[PDB]
């Protein structure tokens, strides 16, 4: 008669940084092409030590999905 | 050409608490009992806010799919 314990881990994180996108929508309701900030990137890369593109095409998914992402995680998810 | 605009956001942290809890076996696939930690519940509801109990049923359920969970938005997923 054997036992074993199971592990639970409980994280906790609200708030933190922000980036504003930009997205050209026309009447009709198409979109033609988004462009996130190229400056709000760029710096952001500085914090974080990313390349800008790399971090365009991060958060550009995102403001597609509407999310969250995690860094220090490498993760991505949303409501 | 109305622009619309998306504020996403960038969380980058690294930490977490762990759980220990009690489950005995025996024909490797019912399980008898299941009790869950009193005492590290009670402190961990100090960092959660909510009643004791609410934590011991969140960590309880969790402990038997075995998982993760985020408070951030109230979530529960496996591990």
């Excluded at 914090?47 to 991505?76: F, N, Q, S, Y």
């Amino acid at each position: 008669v054997p036992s074993r314990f199971e592990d639970v881990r409980v994280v906790q994180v609200v708030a933190g940084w922000r980036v504003s996108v930009k997205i050209a929508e026309t009447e009709e309701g198409e979109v033609v092409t988004v462009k996130a900030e190229f400056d709000e990137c760029r710096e952001i890369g500085e914090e974080t030590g990313i390349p800008p593109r790399e971090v365009k095409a991060m958060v550009e998914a995102a403001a597609r999905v509407g999310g969250w992402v995690d860094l220090k995680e490498r993760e991505i998810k949303v409501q």
